[PDB]
Amino acid sequence: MTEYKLVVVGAGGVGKSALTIQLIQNHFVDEYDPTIEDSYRKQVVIDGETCLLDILDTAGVEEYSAMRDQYMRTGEGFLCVFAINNTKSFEDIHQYREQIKRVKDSDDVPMVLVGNKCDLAARTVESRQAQDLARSYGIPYIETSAKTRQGVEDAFYTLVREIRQH
Ligand SMILES: Nc1nc2c(ncn2[C@@H]2O[C@H](COP(=O)(O)OP(=O)(O)NP(=O)(O)O)[C@@H](O)[C@H]2O)c(=O)[nH]1
Ligand SMILES: [Ca+2]
Ligand SMILES: [Mg+2]
Ligand SMILES: [Mg+2]
């Protein structure tokens, strides 16, 4: 049926893999195993439409992000993830937005800004600060927790709804 190619990007350790695995496999990965490039596929019904989700989980660690650019080129929408307890990952979003623009050769790419680890209390990125960044990009800001599942489905489904507006 209809297929949506989603790509999850962001700094190392922000929770890209945990988010993807929680969405697809329904469990929380507690350990930290740096990702090279992994893909997941699953048939789901989103807003009444039966579709195929192809999610590319990318590397956030520089040393493991070799051919990242090439893997991303096929993506139709991107989840730009940072962790609410990692100010540097939030400041890093700028770099991922630029990479996406290069990979897609477009300044109009479906995207969603995601502030992950919202279950943690050492918050250094306030909601309003992220809402403002998202507003400047003209995209939605959603907070998530791969641990509790809060906002996880919302984040991924919202990205699909953004692709549909493209
Ligand atoms: N409390 C909490 N921990 C989280 C959350 N998401 C991820 N983590 C934890 O953060 C660590 C890194 O998560 P991981 O998904 O591997 O991050 P990544 O962005 O995929 N890293 P990499 O880019 O190297 O592939 C793990 O110990 C994981 O359990 C969350 O929502 N809440
Ligand atoms: Ca391990
Ligand atoms: Mg990972
Ligand atoms: Mg501050």
Curated annotation (Swiss-Prot):
<dbReference type="GO" id="GO:0048471">
    <property type="term" value="C:perinuclear region of cytoplasm"/>
</dbReference>
<keyword id="KW-0963">Cytoplasm</keyword>
<dbReference type="GO" id="GO:0042552">
    <property type="term" value="P:myelination"/>
</dbReference>
<dbReference type="GO" id="GO:0000139">
    <property type="term" value="C:Golgi membrane"/>
</dbReference>
<dbReference type="GO" id="GO:0007166">
    <property type="term" value="P:cell surface receptor signaling pathway"/>
</dbReference>
<dbReference type="GO" id="GO:0043524">
    <property type="term" value="P:negative regulation of neuron apoptotic process"/>
</dbReference>
<dbReference type="GO" id="GO:0036064">
    <property type="term" value="C:ciliary basal body"/>
</dbReference>
<dbReference type="GO" id="GO:0090303">
    <property type="term" value="P:positive regulation of wound healing"/>
</dbReference>
<keyword id="KW-0325">Glycoprotein</keyword>
<feature type="binding site">
    <location>
        <begin position="116"/>
        <end position="119"/>
    </location>
    <ligand>
        <name>GTP</name>
    </ligand>
</feature>
<keyword id="KW-0832">Ubl conjugation</keyword>
<feature type="binding site">
    <location>
        <begin position="13"/>
        <end position="18"/>
    </location>
    <ligand>
        <name>GTP</name>
    </ligand>
</feature>
<keyword id="KW-0225">Disease variant</keyword>
<dbReference type="GO" id="GO:0042127">
    <property type="term" value="P:regulation of cell population proliferation"/>
</dbReference>
<dbReference type="GO" id="GO:0003925">
    <property type="term" value="F:G protein activity"/>
</dbReference>
<dbReference type="GO" id="GO:0098978">
    <property type="term" value="C:glutamatergic synapse"/>
</dbReference>
<dbReference type="GO" id="GO:0051726">
    <property type="term" value="P:regulation of cell cycle"/>
</dbReference>
<dbReference type="GO" id="GO:0009887">
    <property type="term" value="P:animal organ morphogenesis"/>
</dbReference>
<dbReference type="GO" id="GO:1900029">
    <property type="term" value="P:positive regulation of ruffle assembly"/>
</dbReference>
<dbReference type="GO" id="GO:0005829">
    <property type="term" value="C:cytosol"/>
</dbReference>
<dbReference type="GO" id="GO:0160185">
    <property type="term" value="F:phospholipase C activator activity"/>
</dbReference>
<dbReference type="GO" id="GO:0042832">
    <property type="term" value="P:defense response to protozoan"/>
</dbReference>
<dbReference type="GO" id="GO:0045944">
    <property type="term" value="P:positive regulation of transcription by RNA polymerase II"/>
</dbReference>
<comment type="similarity">
    <text>Belongs to the small GTPase superfamily. Ras family.</text>
</comment>
<keyword id="KW-0449">Lipoprotein</keyword>
<keyword id="KW-1003">Cell membrane</keyword>
<feature type="glycosylation site" description="(Microbial infection) O-linked (Glc) threonine; by P.sordellii toxin TcsL">
    <location>
        <position position="35"/>
    </location>
</feature>
<keyword id="KW-0488">Methylation</keyword>
<comment type="function">
    <text>Involved in the activation of Ras protein signal transduction. Ras proteins bind GDP/GTP and possess intrinsic GTPase activity.</text>
</comment>
<dbReference type="GO" id="GO:0032729">
    <property type="term" value="P:positive regulation of type II interferon production"/>
</dbReference>
<dbReference type="GO" id="GO:0008285">
    <property type="term" value="P:negative regulation of cell population proliferation"/>
</dbReference>
<dbReference type="GO" id="GO:0060612">
    <property type="term" value="P:adipose tissue development"/>
</dbReference>
<dbReference type="GO" id="GO:0007165">
    <property type="term" value="P:signal transduction"/>
</dbReference>
<dbReference type="GO" id="GO:0097193">
    <property type="term" value="P:intrinsic apoptotic signaling pathway"/>
</dbReference>
<dbReference type="GO" id="GO:0050852">
    <property type="term" value="P:T cell receptor signaling pathway"/>
</dbReference>
<dbReference type="GO" id="GO:0005794">
    <property type="term" value="C:Golgi apparatus"/>
</dbReference>
<dbReference type="GO" id="GO:0005737">
    <property type="term" value="C:cytoplasm"/>
</dbReference>
<feature type="short sequence motif" description="Effector region">
    <location>
        <begin position="32"/>
        <end position="40"/>
    </location>
</feature>
<dbReference type="GO" id="GO:0007265">
    <property type="term" value="P:Ras protein signal transduction"/>
</dbReference>
<dbReference type="GO" id="GO:0042088">
    <property type="term" value="P:T-helper 1 type immune response"/>
</dbReference>
<keyword id="KW-0007">Acetylation</keyword>
<dbReference type="GO" id="GO:0010629">
    <property type="term" value="P:negative regulation of gene expression"/>
</dbReference>
